[PDB]
Short mmCIF file of C-alpha atoms and ligand atoms in Angstrom, two decimals:
data_model
loop_
_atom_site.label_atom_id
_atom_site.label_comp_id
_atom_site.label_asym_id
_atom_site.label_seq_id
_atom_site.Cartn_x
_atom_site.Cartn_y
_atom_site.Cartn_z
CA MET A 1 157.01 90.17 175.71
CA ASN A 2 153.85 91.88 174.47
CA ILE A 3 152.77 94.87 172.39
CA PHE A 4 153.06 97.26 175.36
CA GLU A 5 156.51 96.17 176.34
CA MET A 6 157.38 96.19 172.64
CA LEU A 7 156.22 99.74 171.95
CA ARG A 8 157.68 100.97 175.15
CA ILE A 9 161.10 99.88 173.93
CA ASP A 10 160.68 101.41 170.53
CA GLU A 11 159.30 104.77 171.65
CA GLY A 12 160.70 105.36 175.12
CA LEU A 13 159.04 107.35 177.91
CA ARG A 14 159.40 111.14 178.17
CA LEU A 15 157.53 113.23 180.68
CA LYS A 16 158.14 116.62 179.09
CA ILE A 17 157.03 117.76 175.61
CA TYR A 18 159.55 117.02 172.95
CA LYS A 19 160.15 116.72 169.25
CA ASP A 20 160.20 113.43 167.49
CA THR A 21 162.53 112.40 164.78
CA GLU A 22 160.20 114.13 162.35
CA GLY A 23 160.30 117.43 164.25
CA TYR A 24 156.77 117.05 165.71
CA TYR A 25 155.57 117.72 169.14
CA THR A 26 155.15 114.62 171.20
CA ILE A 27 154.93 113.40 174.72
CA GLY A 28 155.03 110.23 176.85
CA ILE A 29 155.18 107.00 175.04
CA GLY A 30 155.23 108.11 171.44
CA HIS A 31 151.92 110.03 171.76
CA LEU A 32 151.86 112.66 169.00
CA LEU A 33 150.58 115.99 170.03
CA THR A 34 150.55 117.98 166.80
CA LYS A 35 152.09 118.33 163.45
CA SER A 36 152.23 122.03 164.14
CA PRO A 37 155.30 124.11 164.87
CA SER A 38 153.86 126.01 167.80
CA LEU A 39 154.81 124.90 171.21
CA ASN A 40 151.62 126.57 172.20
CA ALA A 41 149.46 124.64 169.94
CA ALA A 42 151.17 121.73 171.54
CA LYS A 43 150.60 122.82 175.10
CA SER A 44 146.98 123.33 174.19
CA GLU A 45 146.54 119.88 172.76
CA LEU A 46 148.31 118.37 175.74
CA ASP A 47 146.00 119.89 178.31
CA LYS A 48 142.95 118.91 176.37
CA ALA A 49 144.27 115.37 176.15
CA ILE A 50 145.14 115.20 179.80
CA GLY A 51 142.23 117.13 181.11
CA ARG A 52 144.21 119.62 183.10
CA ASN A 53 146.63 122.46 183.05
CA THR A 54 149.93 120.69 182.52
CA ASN A 55 152.30 123.29 181.55
CA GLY A 56 153.96 120.80 179.21
CA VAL A 57 154.63 118.20 181.92
CA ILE A 58 152.82 114.97 182.83
CA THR A 59 153.10 112.19 185.31
CA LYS A 60 154.02 108.60 184.41
CA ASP A 61 150.53 107.47 185.19
CA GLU A 62 149.28 110.17 182.82
CA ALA A 63 151.73 108.91 180.09
CA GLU A 64 150.57 105.37 180.62
CA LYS A 65 146.99 106.42 180.30
CA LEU A 66 147.59 107.97 176.92
CA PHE A 67 149.51 104.91 175.77
CA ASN A 68 146.73 102.56 176.76
CA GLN A 69 144.33 104.67 174.82
CA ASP A 70 146.73 104.74 171.81
CA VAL A 71 147.32 101.01 171.66
CA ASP A 72 143.57 100.43 171.98
CA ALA A 73 142.91 102.78 169.12
CA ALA A 74 145.51 101.08 166.98
CA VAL A 75 143.96 97.70 167.43
CA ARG A 76 140.51 99.14 166.69
CA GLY A 77 141.69 100.99 163.64
CA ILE A 78 143.14 97.73 162.31
CA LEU A 79 139.91 95.81 162.91
CA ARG A 80 137.91 98.45 161.05
CA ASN A 81 140.10 98.84 158.08
CA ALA A 82 139.11 96.97 154.99
CA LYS A 83 142.65 96.53 153.98
CA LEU A 84 143.97 95.74 157.35
CA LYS A 85 141.56 93.47 159.05
CA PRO A 86 142.14 90.58 156.78
CA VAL A 87 145.91 90.72 157.10
CA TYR A 88 145.68 90.72 160.78
CA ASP A 89 143.16 87.96 160.95
CA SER A 90 145.55 85.82 158.95
CA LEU A 91 148.55 86.28 161.15
CA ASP A 92 149.93 84.65 164.31
CA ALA A 93 150.05 86.48 167.62
CA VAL A 94 153.69 87.73 167.36
CA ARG A 95 153.38 89.07 163.87
CA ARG A 96 150.11 90.79 164.90
CA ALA A 97 152.06 92.69 167.46
CA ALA A 98 154.32 93.90 164.70
CA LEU A 99 151.39 95.11 162.59
CA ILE A 100 150.04 96.99 165.61
CA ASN A 101 153.46 98.60 166.08
CA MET A 102 153.58 100.03 162.55
CA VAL A 103 149.97 101.14 162.86
CA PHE A 104 150.68 102.91 166.11
CA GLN A 105 153.64 104.65 164.58
CA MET A 106 152.34 105.55 161.19
CA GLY A 107 148.51 105.41 161.25
CA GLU A 108 146.02 103.05 159.51
CA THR A 109 146.19 105.03 156.36
CA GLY A 110 149.96 104.93 156.25
CA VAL A 111 150.08 101.19 156.64
CA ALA A 112 146.98 100.59 154.61
CA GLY A 113 149.06 101.93 151.78
CA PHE A 114 151.91 99.39 151.87
CA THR A 115 149.99 97.42 149.24
CA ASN A 116 152.69 95.01 148.13
CA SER A 117 154.00 94.17 151.54
CA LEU A 118 150.42 93.55 152.83
CA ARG A 119 149.92 91.06 150.06
CA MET A 120 153.16 89.28 150.75
CA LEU A 121 152.32 89.28 154.46
CA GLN A 122 149.09 87.76 153.55
CA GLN A 123 150.77 85.16 151.34
CA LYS A 124 153.13 84.36 154.23
CA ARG A 125 156.10 85.06 151.98
CA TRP A 126 158.26 86.23 154.94
CA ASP A 127 161.54 86.94 153.22
CA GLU A 128 160.40 89.02 150.28
CA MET A 129 158.15 90.99 152.46
CA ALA A 130 161.12 91.91 154.61
CA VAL A 131 163.02 93.09 151.56
CA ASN A 132 160.05 95.07 150.40
CA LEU A 133 159.39 96.80 153.69
CA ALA A 134 163.01 97.98 153.64
CA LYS A 135 162.60 100.10 150.56
CA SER A 136 160.67 102.71 152.33
CA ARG A 137 160.98 106.15 153.65
CA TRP A 138 159.97 104.58 156.97
CA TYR A 139 163.01 102.26 157.11
CA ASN A 140 165.38 105.01 155.93
CA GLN A 141 164.33 107.48 158.56
CA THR A 142 164.36 105.06 161.49
CA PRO A 143 166.27 102.00 160.47
CA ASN A 144 167.02 100.48 163.89
CA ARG A 145 163.41 100.42 164.87
CA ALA A 146 162.28 99.40 161.41
CA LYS A 147 164.79 96.52 161.47
CA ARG A 148 163.26 95.40 164.72
CA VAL A 149 159.76 95.44 163.34
CA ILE A 150 160.82 93.81 160.10
CA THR A 151 162.60 91.00 161.90
CA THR A 152 159.57 90.41 164.03
CA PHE A 153 157.48 89.90 160.89
CA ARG A 154 160.07 87.78 159.23
CA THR A 155 160.77 85.44 162.00
CA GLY A 156 157.55 85.47 163.84
CA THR A 157 159.56 85.66 167.15
CA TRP A 158 160.50 88.37 169.70
CA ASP A 159 164.21 87.94 169.20
CA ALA A 160 164.86 91.43 167.99
CA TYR A 161 163.58 92.57 171.23
CA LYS A 162 165.33 90.22 173.54
CL1 CL B 201 144.08 111.93 173.01
CL1 CL B 202 166.56 104.05 164.56
#
């Protein structure tokens, strides 16, 4: 089990443009296209991302390429964030995977804002952190996934995913 296998479970793989739970245009492995309501704005973004005229449809390879770029960017955004870097640096390899997951899903900024949980994470207070992450719009909108991520932080193991 690794971050790729982990995010692939959580986001799935879709080869045709679609809406996410939030209503946004997305494709592949959780790759957001646009927060805009126009399927055209979305086809536009897709082709620019892919580098070709897709007509809203990509190959698996193509989807995997975006994903690779997205995970890479998540890791880099963590390592560059003043709030994030230090949390990450303090954690074990499983728990790091969990941080990357949230970052992938919600952006540096989003996570960078969970002030209290970040501190508990840092203080290695596993249980309270888990309670705190749960009082969030994030958990309420996508509780199964959130539970998985939260368990991963709590336990420090891949159980939720096995
Ligand atoms: Cl892109
Ligand atoms: Cl869910």
